[PDB]
Amino acid sequence: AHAFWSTQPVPQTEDETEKIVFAGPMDEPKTVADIPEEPYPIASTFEWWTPNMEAADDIHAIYELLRDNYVEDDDSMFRFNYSEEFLQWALCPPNYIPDWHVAVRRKADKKLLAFIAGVPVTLRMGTPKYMKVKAQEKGEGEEAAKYDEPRHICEINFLCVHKQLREKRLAPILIKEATRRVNRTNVWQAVYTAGVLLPTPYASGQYFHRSLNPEKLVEIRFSGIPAQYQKFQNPMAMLKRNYQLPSAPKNSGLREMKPSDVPQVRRILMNYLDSFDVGPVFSDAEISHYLLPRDGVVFTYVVENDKKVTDFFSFYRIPSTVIGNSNYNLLNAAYVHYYAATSIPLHQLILDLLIVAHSRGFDVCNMVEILDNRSFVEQLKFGAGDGHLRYYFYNWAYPKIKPSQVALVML
Ligand SMILES: CCCCCCCCCCCCCC(=O)SCCNC(=O)CCNC(=O)[C@H](O)C(C)(C)COP(=O)(O)OP(=O)(O)OC[C@H]1O[C@@H](n2cnc3c(N)ncnc32)[C@H](O)[C@@H]1OP(=O)(O)O
Numbered sequence: 001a002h003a004f005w006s007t008q009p010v011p012q013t014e015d016e017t018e019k020i021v022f023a024g025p026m027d028e029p030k031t032v033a034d035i036p037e038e039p040y041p042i043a044s045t046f047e048w049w050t051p052n053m054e055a056a057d058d059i060h061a062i063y064e065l066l067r068d069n070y071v072e073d074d075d076s077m078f079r080f081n082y083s084e085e086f087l088q089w090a091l092c093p094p095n096y097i098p099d100w101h102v103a104v105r106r107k108a109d110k111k112l113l114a115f116i117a118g119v120p121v122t123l124r125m126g127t128p129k130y131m132k133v134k135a136q137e138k139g140e141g142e143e144a145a146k147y148d149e150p151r152h153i154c155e156i157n158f159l160c161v162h163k164q165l166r167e168k169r170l171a172p173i174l175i176k177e178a179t180r181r182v183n184r185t186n187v188w189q190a191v192y193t194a195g196v197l198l199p200t201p202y203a204s205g206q207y208f209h210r211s212l213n214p215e216k217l218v219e220i221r222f223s224g225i226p227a228q229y230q231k232f233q234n235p236m237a238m239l240k241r242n243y244q245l246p247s248a249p250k251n252s253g254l255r256e257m258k259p260s261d262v263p264q265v266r267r268i269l270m271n272y273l274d275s276f277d278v279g280p281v282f283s284d285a286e287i288s289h290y291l292l293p294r295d296g297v298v299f300t301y302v303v304e305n306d307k308k309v310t311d312f313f314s315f316y317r318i319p320s321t322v323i324g325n326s327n328y329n330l331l332n333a334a335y336v337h338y339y340a341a342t343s344i345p346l347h348q349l350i351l352d353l354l355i356v357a358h359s360r361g362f363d364v365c366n367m368v369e370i371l372d373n374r375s376f377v378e379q380l381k382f383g384a385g386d387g388h389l390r391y392y393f394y395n396w397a398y399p400k401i402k403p404s405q406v407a408l409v410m411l
Pocket residue numbers: 001002003004005006069070071072154156157158159160161162165166167168169170171172175178179182183187188189190192193194195196198394395
């Protein structure tokens with residue numbers, strides 16, 4: 001059962017979501033006035049704390065908690081080690097609400113014990129295309145389009161309870177207090193992703209990995225020698241040959257994005273994301289925030305020829321602590337972010353992505369099969385991983401969609 005999730009306004013089973021035909025709210029319509037003004041109760045030995053995610057030392061504290069206690073792969077070989085600069089970037093986009101950053105500490109000694117973060121996002125989340133066609137067949141076009149306008153909602157990420165405090169029903173409390181603070185801002189939906197199955201995803205995608213430094217990955221046990229590489233005299237030399245990349249990008253006029261590219265990159269990205277059922281809508285301020293280059297955090301390259309931006313790609317860095325190997329401290333992973341191609345095939349664009357990432361010392365390039373990411377898997381030699389990313393809404397009925405109809409990248 002789900003003692004917590006059964007009480008929440010989300011579809012409860014796969015069967016329920018097979019049935020949903022229109023996008024819309026699950027819950028009782030409510031007002032800010034209905035929502036408690038005071039934080040949710042918690043044990044006297046704890047307190048709620050709102051870190052200042054633009055203060056270096058508050059960023060450091062959250063950084064430590066995540067470094068030591070956040071997501072691990074299924075065999076606890078790797079643990080995400082999001083950097084402090086990455087955390088300030090992800091948690092402080094334009095018009096972020098400091099209150100949506102919710103921490104728990106031990107009252108006595110201010111020991112940091114748990115965290116959960118909300119940030120705003122304007123998301124297109126109306127009835128997906130395939131369901132609108134059915135709606136129109138049935139004369140229900142109006143019901144189907146009702147919630148088509150981009151909504152100002154909450155994106156939740158970074159939920160983390162300290163390893164000492166697991167299975168004490170703390171996470172429900174964080175979710176409740178997060179829900180309260182968001183409702184008090186008059187926001188009633190949230191979108192979240194997780195690598196675990198909860199009630200109930202609207203989309204689910206596999207993870208894909210493209211080795212950049214195969215000898216290191218094999219050492220740290222990220223990959224391993226496919227027993228078909230045992231056919232060969234020298235498995236390692238063949239593996240390096242298979243994954244070798246150009247040492248310089250191949251598209252003429254590739255360069256890093258600059259501030260004056262903002263409007264053009266906004267246009268081409270928004271034209272592209274508009275073709276997906278679920279996807280974010282970005283102002284210029286959000287385009288500069290989420291895509292302008294930031295050392296060690298986000299890297300974005302544009303194709304410009306005849307000074308017109310016709311193509312761009314972006315990736316962001318999340319290192320992972322290598323928990324089982326002491327020879328290497330870190331796995332240096334690059335994560336495919338947003339992109340758009342109008343002048344060249346997408347595999348040709350993302351090949352440059354791989355070249356840059358390799359060139360900058362990244363060990364592997366990861367992504368989920370959202371967007372048009374499947375369109376370059378084979379030719380660029382990405383392999384499916386163990387993981388799946390599951391997409392969820394809070395308080396929003398949504399029909400099942402393919403991951404290739406999801407245009408929202410989560411950090
Ligand atoms: C309108 C505004 C709405 C805003 C809120 C929207 C909702 C956002 C929801 C959050 C989106 C987060 C997106 C990300 O950041 S996903 C990343 C999650 N973080 C990690 O995996 C880090 C490693 N793990 C931990 O720190 C803890 O294990 C966590 C905190 C994950 C669970 O803590 P713990 O292991 O000590 O368990 P408990 O005894 O306290 O609680 C047990 C209950 O918690 C349910 N549970 C377990 N894992 C998750 C999970 N990832 N999302 C939602 N619920 C989860 C579980 O099914 C059970 O409920 P029920 O089955 O009894 O019913």
